[PDB]
Each structure stands twice: as C-alpha cells, then as structure tokens.
Amino acid sequence: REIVCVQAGQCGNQIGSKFWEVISDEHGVDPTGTYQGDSDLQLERINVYFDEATGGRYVPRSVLIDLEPGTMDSVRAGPYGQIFRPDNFIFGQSGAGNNWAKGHYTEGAELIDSVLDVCCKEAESCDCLQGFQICHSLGGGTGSGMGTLLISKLREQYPDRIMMTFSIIPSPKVSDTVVEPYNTTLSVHQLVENSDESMCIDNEALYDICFRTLKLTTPTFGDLNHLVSAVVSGVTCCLRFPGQLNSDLRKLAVNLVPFPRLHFFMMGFAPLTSRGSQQYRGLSVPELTQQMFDAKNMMQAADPRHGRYLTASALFRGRMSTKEVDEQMLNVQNKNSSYFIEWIPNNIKSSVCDIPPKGLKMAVTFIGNNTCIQEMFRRVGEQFTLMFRRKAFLHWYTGEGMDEMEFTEAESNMNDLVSEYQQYQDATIE
Amino acid sequence: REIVCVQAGQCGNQIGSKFWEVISDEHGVDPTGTYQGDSDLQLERINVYFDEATGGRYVPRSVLIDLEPGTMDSVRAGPYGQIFRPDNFIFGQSGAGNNWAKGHYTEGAELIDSVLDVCCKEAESCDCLQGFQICHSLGGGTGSGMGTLLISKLREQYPDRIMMTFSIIPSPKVSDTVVEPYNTTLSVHQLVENSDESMCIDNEALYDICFRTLKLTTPTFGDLNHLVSAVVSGVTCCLRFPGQLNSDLRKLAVNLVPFPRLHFFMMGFAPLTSRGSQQYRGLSVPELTQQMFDAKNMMQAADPRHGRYLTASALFRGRMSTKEVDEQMLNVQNKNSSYFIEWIPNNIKSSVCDIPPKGLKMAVTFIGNNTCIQEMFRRVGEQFTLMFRRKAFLHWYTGEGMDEMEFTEAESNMNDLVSEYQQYQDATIE
C-alpha cells in the first residue's frame, strides 16, 4: 500500500527535504541511498515509499516541481539530495511572479503535461495505489496555482483514490506577501471541491511552539520543518508497521469527515518538552494526552475554546496498554463535555502502533476537526472583500486573462463554507 | 539465410560503418577480419552476414555506392574500414548536385549496371537468400535518386523476397539544403510502390533523444548513427541466435501490414538512459516495456497519441519468462484500448531471443504501424505546394529533362497515400 508524493514550490521542496531525511533515517537508508539498517522489520514495508534499485539501493517515489531551477539546485545540493532520481526534477524557465493566475494559466499549462506524464508513470507502476500526498503553500504563486491545477488533473484521472494535502496558510498577524488573500481564496475554492482531506499549519503557531514550549534561543526553518516532518511521518506509521489496532488514511477520513465539505483539520504532536525540563518528568499516557489536548500544542492560530470538536483522531506509537488509551479518551470526553458536539456519542478514534520514532519511548499525533476553522476563513474573506471592492491589484490577474466572475464565485463558495460551519456549530437535538 | 546490405550516399555509408562495427563486435571479429571469439554460439551463424575467405578471414556482404569518392575516404578512415572488400566500392567522379533528376537519370543510368552486377554476384553466392537491407537518405541527391533506382531494379529481379529500407527524411525544423521537398516527394512515390517495409527516421528525433535522455554535451552524427545501427542490428537478432519463440522478417511483415500500401513503420530501442541516472534503476521487463511504448523513445517527429495502432511488434533479447511478456502485452492492450483499431482483435506480436547485445542484460526493439505517420507526409506536401505554385526552382530539374507533369503525378500519389491512411483511421464496424 504505496503513496506517491508531490512537492511544489520553495516551501514544499524545503519541507520535503526534511521529510525524506526523517523517513530515510527511520528505515536506515544511507544518504547515498544504500540500506544499512539492522532489522528485517525495516525492510518488510520499504515498498510503501521507496522503489528498489539494483544491488541494495532504494529511491523515493516523489516528484519535485518548480518554475526556476534555483531551488532544484539547492535541494539537489542538500545532504540527502543525492537519493532523488534526476529525471524526477521538473522545472520551467520563468517564475510564477507570486501571482496565482500566472501559476495556474500561463506557466502551469506549459509544464503540467510533463508532470501528469511523470505522475501517471509513477502511479501505474504500483501494484495497488493508495492516495497521493501533496505539500504546498496557498499564499505563494506556483505552489497554489500549479498545485491546484495538478490536483484537478489527478482527480480527473484517479477519482476513486484518496487526495491528501498538507498546506501552509497566512498568519493572522503578519503577512509575508501583499496579495495573499487572492491566492488563498482561489486555492481554498479549488481545494474544497477537489480535496479529500486537508491539514493546515500556521508558521506563527510553530514559532509559539518553539518559544513557549521548547524555549529555543535561535530557531530556524529547519526546526519548523523538522516538527512538520515528524508529524507527517507519524500519520502514516500504522500503514507501515504492525499494531494491535491497524489504521489507514481511508479509515481516518471515514471517522473524521461527517460531511464532504468539512475536511479541514488541525494537527498536533505531543512529547514536545525542553531539554532542561526533560529530566524531571517521565513519559506516560496521561502526560501525552494532557499535552495533546492543550491548545498550546496546536499548529493553528484558531483556538479550540472558541469552537467545538465534531471528531478527533489519536495515533499512538509505542508499547502500551489499551486501558490507558480507552479510559483516557473517555475521561477527557466526560470532563470537558461542553467542547464536544453532543449529537455524536463518541468523537475520538484511537489507533496503536508498536514502533515509536527513534529516541522517544512513546508518541501520539492528533488530528482534529473543529469549527474554529471558520474564523480563519472569515478573516481571509474580510481581507479579500476589502481588497476586491477597491480593485486593489486586479489588473495583474485580469491581464493574465482571468474573468472577474471567478473572484465572486470563489468568494461566494468560501462564504457558504463559513455559513455551513456556523450552522453545524449551533445545531441542536430538539 | 543471408542478408545483403546496400549503403548509398554519405548518410548511408556512415550509418553502415557503425552497423558493421556493432555486428563485427557481437561475433568477435577483429578489425583485421580474424575470428577471436570465445563461444561456438558466435560461429554457428556467422554465415548470415559474413562470407569466409581462405585462411581465417571473413568479409562483410555489403555494397557501397556514391557519386563522389569523399565518402570512401571517410569510411576508409574509420576504425573498421579495412574489413570491406575493395571490389565492392563503386564511385563516380562528380557529385549529384543535390538534384534528384541528375542522380536518377544522368549519372544513375551510367553507374547502375555495375551496381546491379555486384548485387547479383553477391546474391547468387548465397545458398538461400533472405531480404535486402538498404540505408539511404531521402533528402539528398544520389541517395534518393540512385537508391530508388536500385530498389526498383532489385524489385524487378527478386519480387518474392523482402525489400527493407531505412530512410532519413528532412526535418520540418532544420535543413542543410533548400531543395529537400522535391527529392523527398519523388522518393516517397518510388518507395510506396517498390518497398515491402519501410522505416522512417527524423534527425530531429535523434537530437531530442540525445539532448533530453542521454544529456550529451556535444552530440555528433556518430551518436545518431549509433542509435540507428543499434536498432538495425537488433531487428535481425532472432534470425541468427536461438530463442524460445523464433521470429523472422517475413513473420514481422505478415503480422504488420494489413494491406500492401500500409507498409510504413515506427522504430524504437528501449535501454536508453544517462550515465548519471544508470545507478538509479535496475533492469526488469516492466521497465523495458514502459520505455518501449513511451513516445519520447520513438525516432519520428509524429506522436502516436495523434493516431491509432493497427499493429505492433516487440522483439525481446535476454533470459526472461514468457509469462511476463504475454501479460505485459495484455495489460497494455487492455488499458489503452481507444488507441488500437477495433476491427482487429489483437494488435501485438511478441518474440523472445536468448542472446542479448553485448554489455546489456536485456533489450527490446519496437516496430509500430500507426496512422499518425500521415502527418509527416502532409508537412512535406505543404512545403512542396508552396514552392511548386511559383515554379520556384524547377528549371534545374526541367533542364535535366523532367516533365512538369511528373511533379503533379508524384504529388497526387502522396496525397492518395495520406487519404488512404486517414480513411482507415476513421473506419468503423457499423
């Protein structure tokens, strides 16, 4: 049960490099690509992410896309960069210009056929194909436009499979780009129709994680991308190791998504704790559960206390008892009962996997479907209406060729998504 | 079962030199002609391409013809040039002038009798004669005119055997000479009547192979002629080595041509990959099949996706299972069913041979009969119509003696070939 990965734009390629470092480390693959591991358990599921090249070597089933090869040369130059297949790097000759319309319509249509050919070549080689995994930012240019283009083409070609995205979204306090509302709104419009499951991360939340919890003096993007690669590699762990209660991406989707538009989730990872404090408290299931539900440990700016949980999922790694999992999830649901949607009798799914990440006795990753996601969309829609009413930067997009009707459709669809979340927030049994 | 080769013009003689290098290497013949091989499998079919002269020596069954001795000096300067029999070199004293009429009518009729005498001397020495093999360009002067003259004479003398041609045709993008369309049109008229099976190669496709797949920094015509010599030496491999399912040129012809005018074929050779990439992929039958059907690996500018396959053939070299071959051909036929002509129930023939080319574990050559070949002829007809409406250069040809009605007759024959392919493309069961 093998996944094909796509990494798009600068953020996507940077996060991807750390992800493939983490995955190669857990399975004992040398930065030359040679297997150097020490148990058969590592080999027996290597197929999920790697293809086997001759006399030992493994190659990672990933597509790298960018509009200028500068990033591609940076990723090729990294410490694990050699592992990637040279033919898997796809690039153009001119940039997205930080413009969604360029990325979707002009350079997108120029490159997309070579990407679809590579993705189909990789997919049809699999004996049974599981979902695709895509990493990109919505605020950028080539990431948003060409990522959503490719998602639409893959959804046409493989409508029965799963489509999964991890996505970076603009912080509420400081912008990295002036035209963020247009790119975000158009990308969310594309995703809510096309995607099966979407996870959202705020860089501001990772900064607050580092400063408050880890007390790091001088954080760098390597730390933020390491936290993300840790959670990303944690979600798939039950796919690729034994356990008492196996789980799968489709089983997560079936338990998390009540209705098909409500597929945007919050993420967290629990055993975060500073090197000075770590000597003072041993790992146990109550400690992981308490950190896991603390909003301090959640990777979005919206806080659960302003909303209610429709559903949640917890994936546990390690040698552990079923009593602590079942009784902890019952106890947390009972003590905080006002924060759980009352017309579902049990909101949490659990899963347990034997093999923890190296150097931790235990870990859990948390996925949450919470109505407080409506506040992010409302904020983006307000900033979009302020910019659109004044035609603030529209001539760039119209000059590329977009009809103005796209902006009003995307705004209306996002506004209806906000309304639907608000309606499910205030529902009652009657 | 002996093949006689004819090499005509500069392109033909140059490709021939590389072809005879590859064949002499596979049978372990020193460039002096001495056998130095290390297995009986090399010796037991050496007669197919070499005759044995007394006290060790072997001589290659080939006739070299050209109008200026420049080429003879080029072949004599190559690494294997000494092997060729001196009496087999036929040359004049002045060039074709890039003119079809000169090459066909004035110096052609002057030399042609000595070429027919040499070809008959070579043919009548065989105990049983298999088809002829001819290499020439269609855009040149002596290549087109004298090649098609000789082909017509050999078709008069041996109508029950096979006539095979490899032919280079002018790129729509790059040309070395202005009058290419006239020579091409007249040559295509001659080939469609005389030939049994014809393969067409675009120099543009070989440049695109070299630049994209092999990433050669400074390709030369030697590389293009190496790719061509590889396929040419591959098609005959089942004639001259053992295998689990033998095949023959006549069986290929019987399976590929539904009707006698539809004898124009596509070419491919599968194991092509850059020196940097070679560390990244182990050999297997699926990989060869996947490269074999990729239009990137096809030696013509027309792409199969614009047409439909009537028939195809694959010849495999190496130690491999028959089950994998049959099931691969079934899977490709089932998944892409819209690209196969529906009134034929099974379009692919397979063949398997035990002995691979030196230094490769496995190889396949692919021959395809696809209606999109009509697009090449249409482009040539367009350029002809642009020049002919204005009588742009006709006085050279008319001064040699051609009637203008000849040009309109040849144009009409090419237009009918294009129409016949288009009609069979759009045929239906009803």
Next chain:
Amino acid sequence: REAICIHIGQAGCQVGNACWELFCLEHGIQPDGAMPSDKTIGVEDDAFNTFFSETGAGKHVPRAVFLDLEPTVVDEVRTGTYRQLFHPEQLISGKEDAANNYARGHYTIGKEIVDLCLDRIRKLADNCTGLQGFLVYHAVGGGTGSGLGALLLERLSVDYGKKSKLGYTVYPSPQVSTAVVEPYNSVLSTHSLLEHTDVAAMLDNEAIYDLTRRNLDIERPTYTNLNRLIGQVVSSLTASLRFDGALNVDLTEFQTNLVPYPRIHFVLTSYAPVISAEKAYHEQLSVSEISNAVFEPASMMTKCDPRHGKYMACCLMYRGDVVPKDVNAAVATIKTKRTIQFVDWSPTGFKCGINYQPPTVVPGGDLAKVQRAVCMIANSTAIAEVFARIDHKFDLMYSKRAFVHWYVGEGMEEGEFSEAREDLAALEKDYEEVGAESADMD
C-alpha cells in the same frame, strides 16, 4: 465429532492465535505439528480429532481458516512462530481493508475474497465423517467483520443448510468505544446475526477488562489477556466433545435447551475461578463456591446486569474433580436464592455437564492452577437493555444523516437503515413480550 473454526478480521484472527495456542498445548502437539510419543507400547490416543486431522506420516494440521482484508496481521502469522502448523492456503488475505464500512465489505470488497474462502470451507467439510457445527469469531464493530461475516454466513447458510453455526461476537461496549461509526455497523450486522445463526454469544471488552482488574491483579491489561480468557471459555465448552466424563453434552443439546423461540438465541457467558496464584493457595475452591461465583455480576464477560431481568434457561458446565451429588446440591441452593428468578413457564431451568479433564495452565498465563472450574451460558431478558443503548446512539446520529453519504456511495440504499432499525425494534418488543407473565386467563 469434528468442528471447523472460521476466524474473520482483526479481532477474530488475534483471538484465533490464542485459541490455537491453547488447543495445541492442551493436546500436546508441538508448534511444528508433531506429537512427541511418551509410551513405547500402546495405542496413540485420538482426542485431537475434534480440532486436528493427521496426515499418514503423523503430522497434525488444524481445522481453521483465517480471513482478513488487510495483509499485516496474517503476514505476521505467516512469519511468526507457528508458520509450519497451518497450511499456507488456509491463511487468506486481501489487498485493502473495508475502512470501517459495512457497505464496503459487503458490496465492494468482500465479494472478491469470498469465493476462495468458500472453496477452503468446502475442502474441509469434504474431509469429515461427523460434523457438528461451525464456530465463528468476529467483531461487529468493524467494516470487514460485519460485511464479510454477514455475506459469508448467508452463503454458508445456502450451501450447508441444516449444519449449526455458533457465533462468538464482540459487540460495542456500552461506554468504552473505539470508532465513531460503530452503531451503523452493529445495526446492519443484526439481521445477519438474527436469521443466519443458531446461538450467538455476546462479549464486551469493558466487562472482561473489569474482570481482569478486579479478580486478577493486573493494572494494565492488553488484548492478549482477554483473548486467552476467551480461548479458555471455548476450551471449556468444547471439552465435553473431547474427553471422558460423567454427563456429556453435544452441541445440539445447547440449542435444544437454551432457545425457547427461534429468534431468542442471544446468550450471556461467565467463568468462575478467575483467580491469581497468590490467592489460589490461600483458599479452597469447592463446587458450591464456584457455582455461587458464576451468578455474581462480577463474574460476567458481558456488560449487563441480570438482576434487571428474568432467566429463561441456564446451562452449567463443570470440569475437573466434581461429583454429581455436589452439583445437584449446589443447583438446589441456587434455586433457593431470592435474587435469582426464573420465568414461571420455565420450571426446569438448568442443564448440567460434568467432564473429568481439568483446565490447562499456559506458561505465560495469568490464571492460577486449579483443580476444578465451572462455565455458564445463560439466556435472560436483561439483554434487551444492550439493544436500547445501541438504538439510542443510532437515532442520535441518524436524525441528521451524519455519515450516510459514505454508505450510499459504496452501494447501499438509504432505506436499509430504517428497515434494520425496525427489525431490531421488533426484537426488543419480542424480549418485552416473552418475559410478561400469563396473568390473563381466557
């Protein structure tokens, strides 16, 4: 006296590992299938035959199939310690799971795997000379266990006909829960279990967890403990077929004694001397003490309280050093009790069995070694309370169509929810009506 075991999905295969571990160790077959001979002179004995068949060379192989849609657990069995015991064809695994969807298992995915399973079950039944039932282990909470278990029981019921089918079923616990969609799968699992099974015994993990915390001294139990307890129960029930005894009990006698009306076939199970090694040497364990134990609610393996209902029939299995006179004295003392009540139409409420083989002790096990044990299966109207809580949770979710689009997309009509919910409602009314005294005389 043969029986064939069918294990479905994750819970059923994991419980199967503990069961076959126990049956091997109890008969004495080594993990490689050979029985080491002890005496040089004499007959070989033949007791394994209920569960094993021997080849002409004397290897033993077991009468079981393992069914799963995901490979990982069965591939672990294939690579584990018992690799050589099972025939490799018997371990059947698909490509991908039923994703907690009953509809996906029943309509889309189980239809591909089901024909191999039917060919293996047929090949087993052809290699029999006395067959007295199928034993099935599955959970109704997950997708493949519900959907493929129902589809396979339907096919078995057409092909095999009259042959008996006894189910051990893990039902959704009343407040411990593992997945959101459990009510839909359990409701849909109902009709399959109502018309395609002869007796169905229901288990809830929360009760076996309570039993392992209270009686044994285990602070942090895991599924291997529960599965070992279930294996012990099955070994106690099938011991009557396999060893000498005073009062044998054939599997058809259970159906004759326990089932008053053809739909009223759901039974409660409990086990008496669950005790730790340190306590076991401080106490005698007489017949009357363990008989008193099986009626206490702290002993049951299903989370229901029978004091809120009325008993219709009880079947008591004693194994070990017991004398029939003591069993009769115990049953008469139970009958004297005021907190134990039988429906007035069932005066002779008890069936007894007495077998000489004491329960086996497993090297890694947590139960003490004891000279005698008793096991109970009983039919009681209190069971109606479990369905009422399942129906309330279904009604809460179904009032807003909370997940229905998954089920409709995988091939099921929306009508099937209402039909199944009405059938289980009628089953609730049956349990209300059967327990009503005949105060009206006409």
Next chain:
Amino acid sequence: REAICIHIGQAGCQVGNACWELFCLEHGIQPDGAMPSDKTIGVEDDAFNTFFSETGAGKHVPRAVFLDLEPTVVDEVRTGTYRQLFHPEQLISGKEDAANNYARGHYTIGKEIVDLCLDRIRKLADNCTGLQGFLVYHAVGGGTGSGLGALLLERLSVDYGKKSKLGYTVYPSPQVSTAVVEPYNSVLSTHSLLEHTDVAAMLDNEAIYDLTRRNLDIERPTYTNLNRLIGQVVSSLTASLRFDGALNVDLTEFQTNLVPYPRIHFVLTSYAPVISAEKAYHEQLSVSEISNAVFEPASMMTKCDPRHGKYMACCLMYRGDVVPKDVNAAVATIKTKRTIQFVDWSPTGFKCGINYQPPTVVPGGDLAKVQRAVCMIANSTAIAEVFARIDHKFDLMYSKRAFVHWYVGEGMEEGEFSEAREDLAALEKDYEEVGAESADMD
C-alpha cells in the same frame, strides 16, 4: 504394443524434448542410449519396446520423427544432450518457415517437404509388428504446424486407413495471444481436423499458467514447465500399455468410448495431483480427494468451464496405489453432484482404468513425489464457447478482408475462408442439437 510419435513445429519439438526425457528416465535408457562396458544387455526386460527399439548390439533408438521448416530448433536438438539417442534421419529440417501462413505451409512449402516425412514414417512403420496408432503433437496457431500437420494427417489417413490418430493440440488462448493472424489459421486447421482425426485433446497455455501459479509456487514460469506437465499427461495415458495393472485400456478403446457421433471428437483434459513439494507434506492424498479434484475447473489444462455444459462421456485413468472399491465409491459420489450433468441419452457415462505404476520423478522437476494420480479426458458441450469466440474474431477481421492477400498470394482461393466459416457454424449447431433433452422432444 508399439506407438509412433510425430512432432511438428516449435511447440511439438519442445514438448517432445520433455516427453523423451521422461520416457528415457522412466524406462531406464541412458540419454545416449549406450550401456555400461561390462553388461551384455542394458536392461533386463522388453517393456521399453512400446517407445524404443534396440539394435542387436543393444543400443536404443526411439520411435519418433521431428518435423520443422526452420532449422534452429532441430539444430538445438542435434547439438544438445540427446544427440546420440536419435537417428539423424529422424531429425528433419527445412530452409525457411511457413511465416504464420496456413496457405504457405499447406500449398507451397509443406507440399514440398511432406514426401520425406512420409518416407521416414513408413520406414518406422515397417519396423513394427503391432502398431496401434499415431500420437501427434502440434500447435494450430502457427503456419507450419497448422498447414503441414493438416496435410500430413490427410496423407496418413489415406495411406494407413483404419489406424487411430490421436492429437494433442495447442489452441489459441481466449485472451492471451501471440500473433494477429491466429483466428484464420485456427479456423482452417479445425476445418481440416474435423474430417481427419479420431480424438483431439485441446490445451491452452493460459490454463497451464493459472495451474502453475495456484498449485505450483512459480512466480516466473516458462514453456519448459508447461511441456513437463504435458509430458506427464501423455505418460499417464500411455502407461496403460507399458506396466501391469488391474484394468488396462488400449488406445482403440478411447475412440470407441468417447465419440458418440463422428464430428464430436474434441475432449477436455485435466490432471489431479499437480502440487508443490511444500503443500504435499501438509496433506494426505487419498483416492476420493483426487477424484474430487479432477472435476474442479482449477485442475483443467484447457480454459473452459464444464459447468456451462453437459458431459457425454468421461474416461478416468488411475495410476498407482489405488483400490477398486475406493474408485467405485468416489465415482458414485461424483455422480451425486448437482453441478455435474449428463445428457439423458448417455446413462452409462464412465470408463475406468487402474494401473499400478506410480508417476516418475524427474531430477529438475517441480512436481512433488506422490504415490497416486488420476487423469481424465471428457467430452462436453461447453467446448462450443471456445469456437464461438474464435469465429467472432474471424468474422470481425474478415468483414474487411483484413489480411487475405497474404493467403491468396501463398496459393489459396478466397472461397476457402467462407467454406470453413460455414462448417464451423454447423459444428456450433451440432453442439446445440446434441445437447437437447429427449424428454423435451417427447
């Protein structure tokens, strides 16, 4: 007693290598046919005589001819390991192939080569004293096998007359395919074969691939595995001539028992203990188990399902340690089955044979060692489905005269296509008519 084997084309010669390997190793003739330097006779007994003849000096030589139009395969035989076994005249090779054209084999080239073949076969038949048939191995999909096999069978049928001719024929698989022109050659072959063969056994490579994947454990099979299976089948059918047994069966008895009407001579073949070494020690292999096995479609060597038709006659050959009472009990149990149906005009549906010699084990082989085996050839109306699909593909191609100019150029009238197509249509109607119940026609 004696039988002469004729091997034609590529499949027939390659299957011949496996056959003669097996027959040598089973009788005990060395691969070169010589004897140790001290013995006066290589073997004590004459039983070899059915397939080999010895010279007065005691060298052995086999009763076979190898016919091909291309040299390569016969030159491989000439240079291989069995070089000294065959007489060089027996290995006949032409210059050039029949190029997948039935017309080229039949009219132009086989007509030239056929008189040498007939002279060699005559030279064999003159050195015989109780010849009782010809065995022929060929594929009908290729040009020389179809065209020269038909022409040679016609000439043989005129010259030898009443002597029986039994064919083993490789037909084009229903979805695996190797060449485009297979339907034309197979139709024209079947047209010639209808008049001039007494029983024809049909094989498809797709079935033997399925059999080697499910039963054997081979991930990457090749033609040598299939050819060894075919050789085993032929050895099983001819074993009745060569070794002691309870119920012998002469080659003339097959045609008498299997063919009800002179056109209805195409039979299905299957073999029971096709099993791998790892499975063989997990299972007993009694008579009733292999008898139940031969009727399952997973055992067949032709891709047809007999449940879609009616049996007319079955011939069951048992070899090895079998007792007649178990064969009778097994056949009566088979007769009981509801998915096995006989036409009401054929009440006595079975012929039996029982031979004591167990199957031989070949040093490089992939089959396990087993004490007993059974082989069946049977006539059934299900065969009509194979012809209907070949005829539909022929009709599809022939509607546009897609390739006919090759056949007309190699010497054949266009009329022959239409004639053959009406004869195969009439054969389809024959299979419809023979299958009509007598109780329905009153």
Next chain:
Amino acid sequence: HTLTPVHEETVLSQTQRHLNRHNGKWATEYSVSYKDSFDEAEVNKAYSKRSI
C-alpha cells in the same frame, strides 16, 4: 545450480538476520507474548483414549 561456500555464507547470514529480528527496540507483542513454551507445560493424558 549448485552452491559455492560463498552462497552458503550468504544463506547462513540470512538465517541469522531472520533469527535476530524482534530485538530490544523492535519487539512487538506477538514476539514477546506468543513464544515456544512446550517444554515448560505439563501434559495430562489420563482421561483420553482411542476410538473404536
């Protein structure tokens, strides 16, 4: 297709690799729960006989 001593060393290495899996960091619960414990359990055969 005979085996040289190098092939024997490779086969022995593969057997050791299979045996040494499920070490301290890679222990699953099937590995630590279900083991071979036949030599430690007592076997009673007093109340079992052969059918006639």
Next chain:
Amino acid sequence: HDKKYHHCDCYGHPLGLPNYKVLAQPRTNNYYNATGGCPCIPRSAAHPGSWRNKREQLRSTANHFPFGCTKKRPGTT
C-alpha cells in the same frame, strides 16, 4: 412476509437454487444474436483483481436484485 419481521427478499438476497437448465446452455453465436452480442471479454482499465475489473468483466459481481419490502414492492414474481 410474516408479521413484525423482514424476509431475506426484503433485504435483496433471494436464496433459491439456480435454474440449472438455463445454466447448462452453451453460449454460441446464435445465442448472442438473440440477446446482446460479442462473445469477447470486455476490456477494463483497472488492475486485475480489482473490484472495477470484476464489476465490468463478470456477471456475478454486476448482478443486483431488487431491494425493498414485499408489501411496498409490487413484486410481479
């Protein structure tokens, strides 16, 4: 059906034995002329052994009996 309970039909799984007379009829060209046509195997775009392949290649998977309670359904059989 009977009182207060649903039959197997209501759910959509009649359990009667097959009509063996129709099952034993060979499928020739005349049969396909009468009903449908083209005895060739339908081609599929899914992997072998996948539910789409069995759905558009075999009759048993593609079969669907009517669903609904007998009281509301007309039945007509």
